Enzyme design. Structure first.
Site, PDB file in Angstrom:
ATOM      1  N   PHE A   1     -11.846  -6.741  14.225  1.00  0.00           N
ATOM      2  CA  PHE A   1     -10.889  -7.338  13.303  1.00  0.00           C
ATOM      3  C   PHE A   1     -10.403  -6.334  12.268  1.00  0.00           C
ATOM      4  N   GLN A   2      -9.087  -6.133  12.234  1.00  0.00           N
ATOM      5  CA  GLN A   2      -8.449  -5.187  11.322  1.00  0.00           C
ATOM      6  C   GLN A   2      -9.033  -3.783  11.447  1.00  0.00           C
TER       7      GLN A   2
ATOM      8  N   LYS B   1     -17.665  -1.008   6.006  1.00  0.00           N
ATOM      9  CA  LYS B   1     -18.041  -2.058   5.063  1.00  0.00           C
ATOM     10  C   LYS B   1     -19.553  -2.180   4.880  1.00  0.00           C
TER      11      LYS B   1
ATOM     12  N   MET C   1      23.927   9.643   2.396  1.00  0.00           N
ATOM     13  CA  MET C   1      23.652  10.925   3.036  1.00  0.00           C
ATOM     14  C   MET C   1      24.047  10.916   4.509  1.00  0.00           C
TER      15      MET C   1
ATOM     16  N   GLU D   1       0.813  -1.214   0.000  1.00  0.00           N
ATOM     17  CA  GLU D   1       0.000   0.000   0.000  1.00  0.00           C
ATOM     18  C   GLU D   1       0.850   1.269   0.000  1.00  0.00           C
TER      19      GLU D   1
HETATM   20  C1  FAD Z   1      -7.313 -14.087   8.627  1.00  0.00           C
HETATM   21  C2  FAD Z   1      -7.550 -14.197  10.149  1.00  0.00           C
HETATM   22  C3  FAD Z   1      -8.492 -15.106  10.644  1.00  0.00           C
HETATM   23  C4  FAD Z   1      -8.707 -15.207  12.028  1.00  0.00           C
HETATM   24  N1  FAD Z   1      -9.626 -16.097  12.508  1.00  0.00           N
HETATM   25  C5  FAD Z   1      -9.550 -16.460  13.850  1.00  0.00           C
HETATM   26  C6  FAD Z   1     -10.226 -17.713  14.378  1.00  0.00           C
HETATM   27  O1  FAD Z   1     -10.856 -18.427  13.619  1.00  0.00           O
HETATM   28  N2  FAD Z   1     -10.133 -18.049  15.717  1.00  0.00           N
HETATM   29  C7  FAD Z   1      -9.421 -17.243  16.580  1.00  0.00           C
HETATM   30  O2  FAD Z   1      -9.341 -17.543  17.757  1.00  0.00           O
HETATM   31  N3  FAD Z   1      -8.778 -16.060  16.108  1.00  0.00           N
HETATM   32  C8  FAD Z   1      -8.844 -15.668  14.730  1.00  0.00           C
HETATM   33  N4  FAD Z   1      -8.214 -14.519  14.270  1.00  0.00           N
HETATM   34  C9  FAD Z   1      -7.481 -13.725  15.182  1.00  0.00           C
HETATM   35  C10 FAD Z   1      -8.431 -12.799  15.984  1.00  0.00           C
HETATM   36  O3  FAD Z   1      -8.666 -11.617  15.238  1.00  0.00           O
HETATM   37  C11 FAD Z   1      -7.774 -12.419  17.363  1.00  0.00           C
HETATM   38  O4  FAD Z   1      -6.423 -12.356  17.214  1.00  0.00           O
HETATM   39  C12 FAD Z   1      -8.125 -13.441  18.410  1.00  0.00           C
HETATM   40  O5  FAD Z   1      -9.404 -14.012  18.116  1.00  0.00           O
HETATM   41  C13 FAD Z   1      -8.184 -12.773  19.753  1.00  0.00           C
HETATM   42  O6  FAD Z   1      -7.191 -13.321  20.588  1.00  0.00           O
HETATM   43  P1  FAD Z   1      -7.536 -13.495  22.153  1.00  0.00           P
HETATM   44  O7  FAD Z   1      -9.043 -13.737  22.310  1.00  0.00           O
HETATM   45  O8  FAD Z   1      -6.766 -14.687  22.714  1.00  0.00           O
HETATM   46  O9  FAD Z   1      -7.146 -12.198  22.947  1.00  0.00           O
HETATM   47  P2  FAD Z   1      -5.769 -11.464  22.836  1.00  0.00           P
HETATM   48  O10 FAD Z   1      -5.744 -10.596  21.600  1.00  0.00           O
HETATM   49  O11 FAD Z   1      -4.641 -12.499  22.768  1.00  0.00           O
HETATM   50  O12 FAD Z   1      -5.565 -10.537  24.144  1.00  0.00           O
HETATM   51  C14 FAD Z   1      -5.137 -11.164  25.381  1.00  0.00           C
HETATM   52  C15 FAD Z   1      -6.229 -10.938  26.423  1.00  0.00           C
HETATM   53  O13 FAD Z   1      -5.869 -11.566  27.660  1.00  0.00           O
HETATM   54  C16 FAD Z   1      -5.582 -10.524  28.628  1.00  0.00           C
HETATM   55  N5  FAD Z   1      -4.364 -10.803  29.280  1.00  0.00           N
HETATM   56  C17 FAD Z   1      -3.148 -10.567  28.810  1.00  0.00           C
HETATM   57  N6  FAD Z   1      -2.240 -10.969  29.705  1.00  0.00           N
HETATM   58  C18 FAD Z   1      -2.890 -11.484  30.793  1.00  0.00           C
HETATM   59  C19 FAD Z   1      -2.511 -12.058  32.042  1.00  0.00           C
HETATM   60  N7  FAD Z   1      -1.167 -12.189  32.369  1.00  0.00           N
HETATM   61  N8  FAD Z   1      -3.467 -12.471  32.902  1.00  0.00           N
HETATM   62  C20 FAD Z   1      -4.736 -12.347  32.593  1.00  0.00           C
HETATM   63  N9  FAD Z   1      -5.146 -11.816  31.434  1.00  0.00           N
HETATM   64  C21 FAD Z   1      -4.257 -11.379  30.521  1.00  0.00           C
HETATM   65  C22 FAD Z   1      -5.503  -9.263  27.883  1.00  0.00           C
HETATM   66  O14 FAD Z   1      -6.002  -8.177  28.680  1.00  0.00           O
HETATM   67  C23 FAD Z   1      -6.371  -9.483  26.715  1.00  0.00           C
HETATM   68  O15 FAD Z   1      -7.730  -9.181  27.043  1.00  0.00           O
HETATM   69  C24 FAD Z   1      -7.986 -14.404  12.912  1.00  0.00           C
HETATM   70  C25 FAD Z   1      -7.035 -13.486  12.412  1.00  0.00           C
HETATM   71  C26 FAD Z   1      -6.823 -13.388  11.032  1.00  0.00           C
HETATM   72  C27 FAD Z   1      -5.792 -12.396  10.480  1.00  0.00           C
HETATM   73  C1  FAD Z   2      18.154  15.265   1.647  1.00  0.00           C
HETATM   74  C2  FAD Z   2      17.363  16.549   1.313  1.00  0.00           C
HETATM   75  C3  FAD Z   2      18.044  17.757   1.119  1.00  0.00           C
HETATM   76  C4  FAD Z   2      17.326  18.924   0.813  1.00  0.00           C
HETATM   77  N1  FAD Z   2      17.994  20.101   0.623  1.00  0.00           N
HETATM   78  C5  FAD Z   2      17.336  21.129  -0.046  1.00  0.00           C
HETATM   79  C6  FAD Z   2      18.092  22.291  -0.667  1.00  0.00           C
HETATM   80  O1  FAD Z   2      19.306  22.338  -0.582  1.00  0.00           O
HETATM   81  N2  FAD Z   2      17.411  23.298  -1.326  1.00  0.00           N
HETATM   82  C7  FAD Z   2      16.036  23.249  -1.424  1.00  0.00           C
HETATM   83  O2  FAD Z   2      15.441  24.137  -2.006  1.00  0.00           O
HETATM   84  N3  FAD Z   2      15.304  22.168  -0.849  1.00  0.00           N
HETATM   85  C8  FAD Z   2      15.962  21.099  -0.155  1.00  0.00           C
HETATM   86  N4  FAD Z   2      15.249  20.045   0.401  1.00  0.00           N
HETATM   87  C9  FAD Z   2      13.841  20.022   0.268  1.00  0.00           C
HETATM   88  C10 FAD Z   2      13.178  20.938   1.329  1.00  0.00           C
HETATM   89  O3  FAD Z   2      13.016  20.210   2.534  1.00  0.00           O
HETATM   90  C11 FAD Z   2      11.768  21.418   0.819  1.00  0.00           C
HETATM   91  O4  FAD Z   2      11.215  20.445   0.048  1.00  0.00           O
HETATM   92  C12 FAD Z   2      11.904  22.687   0.022  1.00  0.00           C
HETATM   93  O5  FAD Z   2      13.025  23.439   0.499  1.00  0.00           O
HETATM   94  C13 FAD Z   2      10.658  23.509   0.185  1.00  0.00           C
HETATM   95  O6  FAD Z   2      10.025  23.646  -1.065  1.00  0.00           O
HETATM   96  P1  FAD Z   2       9.296  25.047  -1.389  1.00  0.00           P
HETATM   97  O7  FAD Z   2      10.027  26.175  -0.649  1.00  0.00           O
HETATM   98  O8  FAD Z   2       9.341  25.307  -2.892  1.00  0.00           O
HETATM   99  O9  FAD Z   2       7.802  25.010  -0.908  1.00  0.00           O
HETATM  100  P2  FAD Z   2       6.791  23.858  -1.220  1.00  0.00           P
HETATM  101  O10 FAD Z   2       7.020  22.701  -0.278  1.00  0.00           O
HETATM  102  O11 FAD Z   2       6.976  23.393  -2.668  1.00  0.00           O
HETATM  103  O12 FAD Z   2       5.287  24.416  -1.027  1.00  0.00           O
HETATM  104  C14 FAD Z   2       4.703  25.221  -2.083  1.00  0.00           C
HETATM  105  C15 FAD Z   2       4.391  26.599  -1.504  1.00  0.00           C
HETATM  106  O13 FAD Z   2       3.838  27.447  -2.518  1.00  0.00           O
HETATM  107  C16 FAD Z   2       2.440  27.675  -2.202  1.00  0.00           C
HETATM  108  N5  FAD Z   2       1.653  27.462  -3.352  1.00  0.00           N
HETATM  109  C17 FAD Z   2       1.255  26.291  -3.828  1.00  0.00           C
HETATM  110  N6  FAD Z   2       0.530  26.484  -4.934  1.00  0.00           N
HETATM  111  C18 FAD Z   2       0.455  27.826  -5.185  1.00  0.00           C
HETATM  112  C19 FAD Z   2      -0.147  28.656  -6.174  1.00  0.00           C
HETATM  113  N7  FAD Z   2      -0.879  28.087  -7.210  1.00  0.00           N
HETATM  114  N8  FAD Z   2      -0.004  29.997  -6.096  1.00  0.00           N
HETATM  115  C20 FAD Z   2       0.686  30.535  -5.119  1.00  0.00           C
HETATM  116  N9  FAD Z   2       1.273  29.801  -4.164  1.00  0.00           N
HETATM  117  C21 FAD Z   2       1.178  28.458  -4.168  1.00  0.00           C
HETATM  118  C22 FAD Z   2       2.086  26.728  -1.139  1.00  0.00           C
HETATM  119  O14 FAD Z   2       1.123  27.312  -0.247  1.00  0.00           O
HETATM  120  C23 FAD Z   2       3.356  26.489  -0.436  1.00  0.00           C
HETATM  121  O15 FAD Z   2       3.570  27.494   0.558  1.00  0.00           O
HETATM  122  C24 FAD Z   2      15.936  18.886   0.702  1.00  0.00           C
HETATM  123  C25 FAD Z   2      15.249  17.666   0.897  1.00  0.00           C
HETATM  124  C26 FAD Z   2      15.968  16.505   1.202  1.00  0.00           C
HETATM  125  C27 FAD Z   2      15.231  15.176   1.414  1.00  0.00           C
END
Ligand code: FAD
Ligand code: FAD
Ligand code: 6QL
Ligand code: 6QL
Ligand code: TP9
Ligand code: TP9
Ligand code: TP9
Ligand code: MG
Ligand code: MG
Ligand code: MG
Lengths: 583, 583, 288
Positions: free
Chosen positions: B121-122, B171, B485, B59
């Site tokens: 979940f997620q 969703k 760098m 992503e």
């Molecule tokens: C694709 C996918 C599919 C999934 N399908 C399943 C599935 O089918 N079945 C499944 O089980 N999971 C599944 N999950 C995972 C699920 O989302 C969770 O991770 C899981 O269900 C929750 O784990 P848990 O209930 O053991 O709690 P946990 O997330 O492990 O949290 C631990 C809990 O115990 C407590 N705790 C921690 N330490 C202590 C301690 N020392 N003493 C007392 N309490 C404590 C914590 O406060 C917390 O409430 C899936 C994940 C994915 C990515």
């Molecule tokens: C390793 C490294 C080294 C760097 N060293 C340098 C360096 O030596 N020199 C350098 O210049 N940069 C350097 N930078 C980059 C620096 O951090 C900035 O990206 C840069 O200096 C700022 O760009 P800018 O001043 O053009 O403003 P920008 O970040 O390009 O922002 C645009 C500005 O113009 C305005 N604006 C946008 N659209 C319009 C419009 N249509 N009309 C009017 N205004 C508008 C915006 O409001 C904003 O204030 C470096 C980056 C890295 C990663």
């Protein structure tokens, strides 16, 4: 006693204070990726003779490695990144650690204090950004606050319900000279007052009472029991209660054991879900009642008196109201109940053999099953072969998808912290970096990454990390040329209408794309591909017997579906036991 | 007139409404990565016969591609991800688009409305997370709000100061049937009242007045002039005022032209910085006075009357107080001044030849220089060869580091939107995906990714995207086996103390690691490596003449430093013109 | 002190907000829902299974009835000075405990809660969580509008009453039969009490009268009422108190009764903050 590299009266950079603060926390390994705003920290790291740095090729790989390090040890995982783009690359890992309650400390560099809020070079309000996806976070505004904040950060990350803690450090603070005060009290009066006390005897004796009055008890074990392996096993011996585990709780109770119902939930076994469905007593230890497990809450354990033990009071009564609850460490709760169950053993005379036989029946009629087509490799079979050849003692990290479920279904984990997988967030690309961190934490252990072709390629750059660090990471790649999990839902709920789930090359559709072997060869990692099921056993054996890193590209048919399946918000009666992507 | 695929009285999914909402905005290309919470959207995308989806392998690659698409066209870039881990992978791109003011619309899937805030979940509070790193964001709470929100999202992202806008869609909203209302008024009364009016004649005539009274005028051009190429060039003809450009403003005025002072700033040319240092009139058009450019503000153009024209009033007077300011479109401001400068041309009789000769002198004594060692390839030379062989008409995307600066120093960009680079955030791994988006937006154009070995590997997975989509993306990889760098600062400010900046294998130090050629071969992309300077010309030519994707691994000595350099917070007198990593 | 609160009791908690169940204490049995429905459900069970259960807590009730005898709510009468506690109990008798009572915040608030037997709910209007002064008089206004035929009395303190004294205008214009029973101790009594007990009676801006004329009641609250055309009167002697309160009730429309009480009175009993039952204070006042 601790020995510093500086005199108690000698000033030193804040960056050096920070590193020593880590040394005093017992930190042995960090995952740091350098940048302009964190150079001082990296310079200070080289002055440390006790802290090893594993350089990733991406900060997301860095934080995921910290997770694997944490999940496979119980220790907190530490990752370090620079300001701006470095910090924003940690986001997924922070959110991941929060949802799965993983102890983790993330340190990010930051622009000078005077430059904050000025849209400065590589400036990101990372504290503002990560406040909702971390347990706690900090913005260091003074060099003298560094020792206290670090101590609080590690305390918050590891105590209670574990989680990610982010510490943002401005560059000018890193450069400022100061003399650190290591004996200053933490400033968390609210958090510590809320810290659960050891479980009372009244609550524990009420649980044991319900157990004796029940006839169909079921253990609902989750990730909260990862440190209670011995206590839980002892509890089971005294009660004879069958164990159903979550995705996060695998390994807490041995899966090769007779009383193990394996995993319950959406893709849980038929007998595990059956047990909970018809239970009259549900012992929920270390779970959070996720909708992936419960499905339709109103139907989840509808006829069962529920016992919930959690260390977070915010989880007790959130989704379901328990008849008996204990807010505290499940490890202590088990210890307390074990002593009661043993001295009162002859008086109680617990025996759930009738219930166990009823479950053993369901275990016979509806076991975990897969189908073999000609010489095509079943992904399920490949994993079970890995189990046999590693004797179930290997550390398994996975990506997210179909391969993740099969890795959870067809591997019997003997102990906890063998199973490293993103559960709550379910983040792809987690497998390979987590394997890295686990291998560093456990050098003598067999570490295998069961990955999908989609998940593996996301953080494929970490193959470089593996070779440079010389880590014996094995990569069991289940290649179906698809985003299998999404593809499965397409087949079942969208009439097999493909919507960007094919990962190969449409120009050459019958060619495996990409060539993952060349990815490994690019990083000097020995690799091989297997297509025929007969060649699979020796291939996996070769991967294990070959010293160092290894990639095995296992080609599987993409028509495979994960079974069984309970649809979202569904009940046990809605379970799907048949069907695939074939016609 | 627009033609829908649905009847005006026919209900349809919210996902279909969303896609049609994009069709009505003239969207032709999206960068979407499927997931459980966004399947409905992807299903709806397949029903569209006008919207093409480019599937990335990450992503972050998806959002960076949307940037390159946007930066190289002027159109808004659109990327789509699923909930949780999909959304959190967009973060770096969102922050990047905000700092560089890039028009971009990001759409993320989300858990059902009733499941929000339940640690589902997620689930990720992406709105809460991205509020500080986006221009605006939305959380759709009703299916009927989709057409209005989308129209507002594209309006906010493209109007005024362009920026990223995130729309989070639950969703259940995607699945809900409804009949969309396309003619509903936008609800942005505050934003529209703040929209700058066309520049008044009084302000413009005051600027022209200062010009006639000045003897040492200098143009300070930035990213705000990307759409004012014709107007700016016309302005220069009428005034004869030399042009100094920012990193973001390259190409606005032709760099091969005699009046071009090229880039100013930290790594700007000696004569560009000299011009501003001794100017008595500073025409700041489309800039934001960054500390990378100004350095020590109190010394930046200390003897110059400053004219600042910006479309964002929050930037006018932030860092420096201008003597004359115009809040509005610089394109209109130029148009207004051009007409005045032409009808009053004979009356004004502008002539800054004496000032230009003074600058031309500095241009002679201190030009952009590099050194050639034996047959080792100078990274500077390689880029200038690419300029000659592409006639400076190629679209150049880069990563971040030493290679980024040299790509900005040794390539004369004829037009704007040839230069695609992360400036504000400075995010590595930007180069390759940005090249993808640019190639899709500009099919007939020469697209080259000038990348560093560290930046390239971060999103190396997008090589798969390039082959599958059959994009003629050229990858000019400047390989120094280091994080150049950071390494440069180590050499100059930390006594060459290496702190995790080496990217190769310490076990085999004299071997190029990783083998980037095998990365390309894994994705079926033809690649080659060049080491000797004599072989460089034909190698680059081969890369260009070879149809489709191509990777050229250019090996350069890592001892090279980017020159010249003004240290952070420094002045013009602090400029460094000599030195490298050699002894 | 939570750890000592019902330390030997199995706790049953019924709340409609799940965020409250298990926050401070872990219940052995919990029900998340309407307590009205929970009672209805338990009532039907307790009645059909009545002969089977045979509940009888007479022994426990007698144990409590004992404590009720030895340590009842008590106040002391000094000469003809009006006890604030006594005044409220007189209001109870003359209104038959059917009046709606709104209060300010302080000593008078506690006594209004201790010495009035409320027959039904929603007779008692008082700021509990925030404990905001000046709540009494306006709350009485709203209550009188909602309940026109009801006896509405504002038991206020001289500090709380003056904060929103401007609402006396509202009362007259709207013609509301609001009664104001003002317990005047010329002090911020509640804060003054803590001063006496925890700060060696060191007065820190708790006196509300005029130091220039210390033995004069200040301000003259009667003139406040007269300014808004509200009939008012002041009572100082305990013997005159009964007829004074009766007059306030029998007089149609708004009425203000300025009841003068000695400021040395303390609210009893008292368990100090974070204290236990063993720390309860049953004796003592601001006198020497
Ligand atoms: C694709 C996918 C599919 C999934 N399908 C399943 C599935 O089918 N079945 C499944 O089980 N999971 C599944 N999950 C995972 C699920 O989302 C969770 O991770 C899981 O269900 C929750 O784990 P848990 O209930 O053991 O709690 P946990 O997330 O492990 O949290 C631990 C809990 O115990 C407590 N705790 C921690 N330490 C202590 C301690 N020392 N003493 C007392 N309490 C404590 C914590 O406060 C917390 O409430 C899936 C994940 C994915 C990515
Ligand atoms: C390793 C490294 C080294 C760097 N060293 C340098 C360096 O030596 N020199 C350098 O210049 N940069 C350097 N930078 C980059 C620096 O951090 C900035 O990206 C840069 O200096 C700022 O760009 P800018 O001043 O053009 O403003 P920008 O970040 O390009 O922002 C645009 C500005 O113009 C305005 N604006 C946008 N659209 C319009 C419009 N249509 N009309 C009017 N205004 C508008 C915006 O409001 C904003 O204030 C470096 C980056 C890295 C990663
Ligand atoms: C390694 O290469 C580079 C390049 C670069 O600019 C191109 N910056 C940095 O470090 C920073 C990172 C983030 C913000 C920065 O700004 C900054 N930092 C200071 O810390 C001492 C001081 C300062 O004064 C202007 N500006 C700085 C900075 O070092 O300039 N490192
Ligand atoms: C319980 O009712 C519902 C309804 C609903 O939308 C109709 N969503 C969810 O949770 C999700 C949250 C996020 C993504 C989702 O899609 C999804 N979930 C999976 O769970 C493992 C797998 C999957 O594979 C494509 N997709 C889902 C999903 O359950 O559909 N739950
Ligand atoms: C797209 C997706 N989920 C959406 C998604 C997107 N992006 C991220 C970072 N995480 C997730 N979970 C999945 S599970 C399919 C991944 O397929 P795979 O990695 O090749 O594994 P498999 O095909 O066995 O299911
Ligand atoms: C580490 C770093 N900056 C910190 C950093 C970390 N992570 C990200 C995403 N972005 C940045 N800018 C740089 S510029 C070095 C990159 O080196 P390179 O990509 O190989 O290019 P070059 O060596 O020519 O400078
Ligand atoms: C100052 C104070 N509390 C602080 C205070 C300040 N301001 C407000 C709005 N509310 C409160 N609770 C109290 S209870 C004393 C009020 O004295 P009173 O209104 O005359 O009643 P009494 O003297 O019987 O306690
Ligand atoms: Mg796959
Ligand atoms: Mg490099
Ligand atoms: Mg008072």
């Amino acid at each position: 006693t601790f020995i510093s590299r500086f005199a108690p009266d000698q000033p030193r950079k804040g960056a050096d204070i920070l590193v020593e603060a880590l040394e005093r926390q017992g930190v042995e390994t960090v995952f740091a990726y350098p940048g302009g705003a964190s150079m001082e920290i990296h310079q200070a790291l080289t002055r440390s003779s006790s802290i090893r740095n594993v350089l990733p090729r991406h900060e997301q790989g860095g934080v995921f490695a910290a997770e694997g390090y944490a999940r496979s040890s119980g220790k907190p995982g530490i990752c370090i990144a620079t300001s701006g783009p470095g910090a924003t690359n940690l986001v997924s890992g922070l959110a991941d650690a929060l949802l799965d309650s993983v102890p983790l400390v993330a340190i990010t560099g930051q622009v000078p204090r005077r430059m904050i809020g000025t849209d400065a070079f590589q400036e990101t309000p990372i504290v503002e950004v990560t406040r909702s996806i971390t347990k706690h976070n900090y913005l260091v505004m003074d060099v003298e606050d560094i020792p206290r904040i670090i101590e609080e950060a590690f305390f918050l990350a590891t105590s209670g319900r574990p989680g990610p803690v982010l510490v943002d450090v401005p560059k000018d603070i890193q450069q400022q000279l100061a003399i650190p005060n290591w004996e200053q009290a933490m400033r968390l009066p609210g958090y510590m007052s809320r810290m659960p006390k050891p479980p009372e005897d009244s609550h524990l004796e009420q649980i044991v009472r319900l157990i004796s009055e029940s006839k169909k008890p079921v253990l609902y074990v989750g990730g909260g029991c990862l440190n209670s392996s011995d206590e839980l096993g002892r509890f089971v011996e005294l009660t004879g209660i069958p164990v159903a585990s979550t995705l996060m709780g695998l390994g807490s109770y041995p899966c090769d054991d007779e009383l193990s119902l394996h995993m319950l939930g959406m893709h849980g076994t038929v007998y595990a879900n059956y047990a909970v469905e018809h239970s009259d007593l549900l012992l929920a230890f270390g779970v959070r009642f996720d909708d992936r497990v419960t499905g339709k809450l109103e139907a989840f354990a509808s006829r069962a008196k529920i016992v919930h033990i959690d260390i977070d009071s915010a989880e007790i009564g959130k989704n379901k109201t328990p008849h008996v609850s204990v807010c505290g460490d499940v490890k202590l709760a088990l210890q307390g109940m074990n002593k009661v169950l043993e001295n009162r053993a002859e008086e109680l005379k617990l025996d759930f053999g009738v219930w166990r036989n009823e479950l053993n029946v369901q275990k016979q009629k509806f076991p975990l099953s897969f189908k073999t087509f000609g010489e095509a490799i079943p992904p399920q079979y490949a994993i079970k072969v890995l189990d046999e050849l590693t004797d179930g003692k290997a550390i398994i990290s996975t990506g997210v998808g179909q391969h993740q479920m099969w890795a959870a279904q067809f591997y019997n984990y003997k102990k906890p912290r063998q199973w490293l997988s993103s559960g709550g967030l379910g983040a792809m690309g987690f497998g390979l970096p987590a394997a890295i961190g686990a291998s560093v934490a456990n050098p003598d252990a067999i570490v295998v990454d069961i990955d999908g072709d989609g998940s593996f390629i996301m953080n494929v750059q970490e193959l470089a990390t593996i070779r440079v660090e010389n880590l014996p990471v094995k990569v069991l790649l289940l290649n179906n040329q698809h985003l299998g999990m999404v593809m499965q839902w397409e087949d079942r709920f969208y009439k097999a209408n493909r919507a960007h789930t094919f990962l190969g090359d449409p120009a050459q559709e019958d060619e495996i794309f990409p060539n993952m072997l060349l990815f490994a060869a690019a990083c000097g990692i020995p690799a091989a591909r297997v297509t025929k099921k007969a060649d699979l056993r020796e291939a996996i054996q070769t991967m294990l017997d070959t010293p160092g890193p290894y990639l095995l590209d296992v080609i599987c048919p993409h028509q495979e579906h994960v079974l069984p399946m309970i649809p979202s918000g569904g009940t046990f009666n809605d379970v799907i036991t048949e069907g695939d992507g074939r016609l």
